[PDB]
Write an enzyme that holds these catalytic residues in place. Structure first.
Site, mmCIF file in Angstrom:
data_model
loop_
_atom_site.group_PDB
_atom_site.id
_atom_site.type_symbol
_atom_site.label_atom_id
_atom_site.label_comp_id
_atom_site.label_asym_id
_atom_site.label_seq_id
_atom_site.Cartn_x
_atom_site.Cartn_y
_atom_site.Cartn_z
ATOM 1 C CB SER B 107 -0.970 -0.067 1.207
ATOM 2 O OG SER B 107 -1.793 1.089 1.308
ATOM 3 N N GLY B 280 -16.592 -12.054 -2.181
ATOM 4 C CA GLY B 280 -15.456 -12.342 -1.323
ATOM 5 C C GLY B 280 -14.458 -11.208 -1.157
ATOM 6 C CG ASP B 311 -6.001 -3.495 -4.069
ATOM 7 O OD1 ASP B 311 -6.189 -4.719 -3.971
ATOM 8 O OD2 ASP B 311 -4.929 -2.937 -3.810
ATOM 9 C CG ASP B 351 -9.985 -7.556 -0.854
ATOM 10 O OD1 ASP B 351 -10.688 -7.666 -1.876
ATOM 11 O OD2 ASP B 351 -10.433 -7.304 0.260
ATOM 12 C CG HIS B 352 -5.324 -2.279 -0.444
ATOM 13 N ND1 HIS B 352 -5.257 -1.612 0.765
ATOM 14 C CD2 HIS B 352 -4.307 -1.786 -1.200
ATOM 15 C CE1 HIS B 352 -4.240 -0.766 0.741
ATOM 16 N NE2 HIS B 352 -3.646 -0.857 -0.441
ATOM 17 C CD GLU B 354 -9.365 -11.372 -0.768
ATOM 18 O OE1 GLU B 354 -8.896 -11.169 -1.931
ATOM 19 O OE2 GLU B 354 -10.450 -11.984 -0.562
ATOM 20 C CG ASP B 359 -11.244 -9.899 4.034
ATOM 21 O OD1 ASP B 359 -12.018 -9.637 4.974
ATOM 22 O OD2 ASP B 359 -11.621 -10.329 2.916
ATOM 23 N N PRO B 360 -9.803 -12.941 4.811
ATOM 24 C CG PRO B 360 -11.309 -14.328 5.997
ATOM 25 C CD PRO B 360 -10.818 -12.901 5.888
HETATM 26 CA CA LIG Z 1 -12.300 -12.531 1.396
#
Ligand SMILES: [Ca+2]
Ligand SMILES: [Ca+2]
Ligand SMILES: [Zn+2]
Ligand SMILES: [Zn+2]
Lengths: 384, 381
Positions: B107, B280, B311, B351-352, B354, B359-360
């Site tokens: 980031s 998700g 993201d 993700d940003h 993940e 986060d899972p």
């Molecule tokens: Ca997730």
């Protein structure tokens, strides 16, 4: 200078490894890192990390294996008696050359002193309980119980309850002991009501089959530890920390005539005007001043010989107890005249520093901690 | 071999903090622990999350080589905060005399790691000239000719800024993100905590959470503070125009290997070109951020359809390397790592949050991702 032996630091009924408590050092606390200060001044220093709540026996065994390598062997006889694993954890060995023939200095704080005396005692004499048992049952014996291992050139004890501490007799002692434990946690920025994922402060209760579980806060774990053998039985720090148990310990744990013993006493109280009772000074760690010191310097007990000499205290341990063993003991304590004498307790005297200040866990700007340990190291660096 | 140094973005915290919930590993565990156990010398920085890249670079420098943080007399004179900060003992003092590290930044971290290289390499003339003019010491950071970095790796970094800053309710929503990241570590924004928990490291600003003060209440004070209202903030460098202004002077050194990992978690609509979050995606970004990210245009700013892939936090196109106001060159990974340019390692479906485990994401082998990167970085030492 003319012994080259490493220094080996040893904690008491609270204490952890360097990797533990997020790097917050037992030896140095908020003041920093005592092992590092020593190493940087050319005194090679290593840190032991044994069961804080376990018995001195358990801890010596743990301490030996940590020193020369191997699996911890508590003794078949001992294991059978107290109902716990004979075998513990495996350590690579900090100094495996010590079998062939190095030497160490142990510097020990609080109950560490008791465990250092018994490590040396066991190193020289073994245990004839474990010897007789092994031949009876035709099993093996840890070299710790054979005897003829003379490798400890000095034990230095700091604020050690050689004759015990009287805090044990306090009415709410069980609960307040674990609050001490939680206080030391707070001191290191570690909270007692959160399930840390990491072990953080490992109590090393492998023998007893007790570990903090995933999703278990320290409060919960300690509440379970209170009902467990490690708080309940004979085989515990609690037992060896009482005036009677230190007494039993003293009766068999004598000074090696081949070791230099040093004692530092601590005080952080003043005498009453009309009574002889001791009272905590301004600056004593908050927890001790409130919970522990009032009892410590007012508790009298004619049955156990607990009179005015026991009232002066460092917030945790009765000051008179730190000289060296007396109750149940044969050892000789002499005041430091200038030359450190062998086979005897060299009483280095009493410091205006509380049970937590001498290790740095509570601040004391008036007390130069770095100079105290560097001064010590150089005393130890003189020889046989 | 070179040790590895992990660097957080606009959120992040040292190992002792957040009750041991790790920025680098979150719910998935402890990334740095994994790298040490597989035998990669690995360390963790904790600079100020909300502070500018300038500030957090000055801090990172002192955490590494030891010392008392010096933000520069010219810099401090200019923005109205303390020149001197925390004193650190140092992780790797050997860096002054021979050493080398691998920075891995996530980031905003990637802006910081670059500004850290540019300062080491060419100093700051402004501080240098200001020091002659006002009789003040200069930090070694501003002299030039220090070049101990070796590798910079940006994962999900807004090199050209993120478009999220332009959101109408950004102030309030940014801090809600901050408190969702608190909630992912089981920390509550309404509990009047006594432990420090999460230190925002704003000494220089004279800001600190008061004991018994909730993060709710603190964050209200922080919104009205200069670390949110000034030019010298994570917020301004995070901006598209603030990133440009960064990129105009933070070049890539010839002496360093830069690696860029971009990141995506959206699908393109057939008609509009707008982007929508995949199922998700972390619930907070999914709801609060990605719809804006996926639809925000502004042709004065040059915000094309190109900017909409995201993201959840940062725009995907902003992540391969600096471009707006940059001469940094960017090659896509040809199998062998080139030097003095951005090696674009591709785009991942993560993700940003993940990509660092906050986060899972079961289908994402986070442990294997970072072990892989380590070797790639060790193909150099
Ligand atoms: Ca997730
Ligand atoms: Ca104090
Ligand atoms: Zn035992
Ligand atoms: Zn600044």
């Amino acid at each position: 200078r003319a012994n080259d032996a490493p220094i080996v630091l040893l904690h008491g009924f609270t204490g952890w490894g360097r990797e533990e408590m997020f790097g917050f050092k037992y030896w140095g606390g908020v003041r920093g890192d005592i092992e590092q200060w020593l190493n940087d001044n050319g005194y090679r220093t290593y840190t032991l990390a044994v069961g804080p709540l376990s018995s001195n026996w358990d801890r010596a065994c743990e301490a030996y294996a940590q020193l020369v390598g191997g699996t911890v062997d508590y003794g078949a006889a001992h294991a059978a008696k107290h109902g716990h694993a004979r075998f513990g954890r495996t350590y690579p060995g900090l100094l495996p050359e010590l079998k062939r023939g190095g030497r160490i200095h142990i510097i020990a704080h609080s109950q560490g002193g008791q465990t250092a005396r018994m490590l040396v005692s066991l190193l020289e004499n073994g245990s004839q309980e474990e010897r007789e048992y092994a031949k009876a049952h035709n099993v093996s014996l840890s070299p710790l119980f054979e005897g003829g291992h003379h490798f400890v050139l000095s034990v230095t004890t700091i604020a050690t309850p050689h004759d015990g501490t009287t805090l044990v007799n306090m009415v709410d002692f069980t609960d307040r002991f674990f609050d001490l434990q939680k206080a030391v946690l707070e001191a290191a920025a570690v909270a007692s009501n959160v399930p840390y994922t990491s072990q953080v402060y490992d109590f090393k209760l492998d023998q007893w089959g007790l570990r903090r579980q995933p999703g278990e806060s320290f409060d919960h774990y300690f509440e379970r530890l209170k009902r467990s053998p490690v708080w309940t039985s004979t085989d515990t720090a609690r037992y060896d920390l009482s005036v009677s148990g230190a007494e039993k310990l003293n009766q068999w744990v004598q000074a090696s005539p081949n070791t230099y013993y040093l004692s530092f006493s601590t005080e952080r109280t003043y005498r009453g005007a009309l009574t002889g009772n001791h009272y905590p000074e301004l600056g004593m760690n908050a927890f001790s001043a409130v919970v522990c010191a009032p009892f410590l310097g007012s508790y009298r007990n004619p049955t156990l010989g607990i009179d005015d000499r026991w009232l002066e205290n460092d917030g945790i341990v009765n000051t008179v107890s730190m000289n060296g063993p007396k109750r149940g003991s044969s050892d000789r304590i002499v005041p430091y005249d200038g030359t450190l004498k062998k086979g005897v307790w060299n009483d280095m005297g009493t410091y205006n520093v509380d049970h937590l200040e001498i290790i740095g866990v509570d601040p004391n700007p008036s007390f130069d901690i770095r100079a105290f340990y560097l001064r010590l190291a150089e005393q130890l660096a003189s020889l046989r």
